[PDB]
Every structure is written in structure tokens, then in C-alpha cells.
UniProtKB/Swiss-Prot annotation:
The active site is at residues 94, 137. Belongs to the peptidase S16 family. The gene is LONP1. Homohexamer. Organized in a ring with a central cavity. The ATP-binding and proteolytic domains (AP-domain) form a hexameric chamber, while the N-terminal domain is arranged as a trimer of dimers. DNA and RNA binding is stimulated by substrate and inhibited by ATP binding. Interacts with TWNK and mitochondrial DNA polymerase subunit POLG. The Lon N-terminal domains are crucial for the overall structure of the protein, maintaining it in a conformation allowing its proper functioning. ATP-dependent serine protease that mediates the selective degradation of misfolded, unassembled or oxidatively damaged polypeptides as well as certain short-lived regulatory proteins in the mitochondrial matrix. Endogenous substrates include mitochondrial steroidogenic acute regulatory (StAR) protein, DELE1, helicase Twinkle (TWNK) and the large ribosomal subunit protein MRPL32/bL32m. MRPL32/bL32m is protected from degradation by LONP1 when it is bound to a nucleic acid (RNA), but TWNK is not. May also have a chaperone function in the assembly of inner membrane protein complexes. It is found in: Mitochondrion matrix. It is linked to CODAS syndrome: A rare syndrome characterized by the combination of cerebral, ocular, dental, auricular, and skeletal features. These include developmental delay, craniofacial anomalies, cataracts, ptosis, median nasal groove, delayed tooth eruption, hearing loss, short stature, delayed epiphyseal ossification, metaphyseal hip dysplasia, and vertebral coronal clefts. Changing residue 17 to P: Has normal basal, but low stimulated ATPase activity, and abolishes peptidase activity. This is Lon protease homolog, mitochondrial. Duodenum, heart, lung and liver, but not thymus. Coiled coil: none annotated. The chain holds residues 754 to 950 of 959 of the full protein. Residues 6-188 form the Lon proteolytic domain. It comes from Homo sapiens (Human). It comes from the Eukaryota.
Length: 189
């Protein structure tokens, strides 16, 4: 199956691939000090992925300054973000939306929708950009029991290049901006 059967606040399921195939990953976040905040990052992340964490971090604060200006959690807290397993090298920008979601989930004290997974690059203003490995990611999500998958709008052709027996029985959302992801990940906000 997968590392988390049920995700608590601050944990979001993302997807990855290599030449060997696709996999699921979980972005984890946590306070490292009790309540000018900071973000510490671990998980053998490559340079491009570390930058995406910085972009996601800035965007998550801006997004929270709007959706809930009274919530200074991300602006003041000292947070640690991790992507297990600890020894596996990871890179690329396709977990940006995953990281935004983990940070907002932690700052609101609200888990995301269960059996949900996502992949997509996020820009500084929250645009969702296309990524690679749609086939492998989709197959790995299915195998892990994911019932709701979130993909960049520009990966739509990639998704429907797949045979119907792969994609049927999958609730899929194609998104252009992170706000759409927020409404799917957090339906009761």
C-alpha cells in the first residue's frame, strides 16, 4: 500500500517516478519550536526541489494572508518539512503544490481529504505548471488506493493518453491555479 493509511494535519500525499516506475511519497511538516518564522527542509532533496520548497513556502504564506489574514501561523512559526524515506534522493519541481498543501494543512490544523494525491509545479503566484511521469504517477496512485488525484491542467492530454482501464474509476481534477487545489484538498473551508 503506502506509508500513511490516514494522514494527520500537515501531511500530504504526493507522487514520484524514476525509470523503474512510479511511487507515492508523503510530505511531512511539523513545528520545531513552540508558538519571523523559518523553514528547515530534509529528505535528500536536490537543488530544484529545495527551490520549489522555498517557492511553495512564500506562496503558502501569501495564500494564507488572504484566505485567513488572522492566521499568522506560517509567518511566525518555526517549521520542519521532510520527505521520507530519509536516504532516497529526490529532485524536480513536481511536489510544489504538495508542499503548499502540507504547509497550509499544518497551519490550519486540518487534514486534507483522505485517499487524495497530487503532483504539479507551483509558481510564485500559485499557477500550476505541467510535470512529467503522468503515467507512472497515476498507476502508482491507483495501486496505493488513491481515489482522488490532482494534476496540472496542461497534463490532461498525458492523462487521456492512458488506456481507459487505467483511468476509469478515478476522480481526477485538472487545475490551473493552486486555489482549485485548495478547494479539493479542503472541501469544508
Amino acid at each position: 500500500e503506502r506509508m500513511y493509511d490516514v494522514t494527520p494535519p500537515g501531511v500530504v500525499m504526493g507522487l514520484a517516478w524514476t525509470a523503474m516506475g512510479g511511487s507515492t511519497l508523503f510530505v511531512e511538516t511539523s513545528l520545531r519550536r513552540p508558538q519571523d518564522g523559518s523553514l528547515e527542509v530534509t529528505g535528500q532533496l536536490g537543488e530544484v526541489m529545495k527551490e520549489s520548497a522555498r517557492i511553495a513556502y512564500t506562496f503558502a504564506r501569501a495564500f494564507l494572508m488572504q484566505h485567513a489574514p488572522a492566521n499568522d501561523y506560517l509567518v511566525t512559526s518555526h517549521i520542519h518539512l521532510h520527505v521520507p524515506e530519509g536516504a532516497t534522493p529526490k529532485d524536480g519541481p513536481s511536489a510544489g503544490c504538495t508542499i503548499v498543501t502540507a504547509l497550509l494543512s499544518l497551519a490550519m490544523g486540518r487534514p486534507v481529504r483522505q485517499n487524495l494525491a497530487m503532483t504539479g509545479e507551483v509558481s510564485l503566484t500559485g499557477k500550476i505548471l505541467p510535470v512529467g511521469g503522468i503515467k507512472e504517477k497515476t498507476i502508482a496512485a491507483k495501486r496505493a488506493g488513491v481515489t482522488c488525484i490532482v494534476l496540472p491542467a496542461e497534463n490532461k492530454k498525458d492523462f487521456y493518453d492512458l488506456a481507459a482501464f487505467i483511468t476509469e474509476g478515478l476522480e481526477v481534477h485538472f487545475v490551473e491555479h493552486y486555489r482549485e487545489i485548495f478547494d479539493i484538498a479542503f472541501p469544508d473551508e
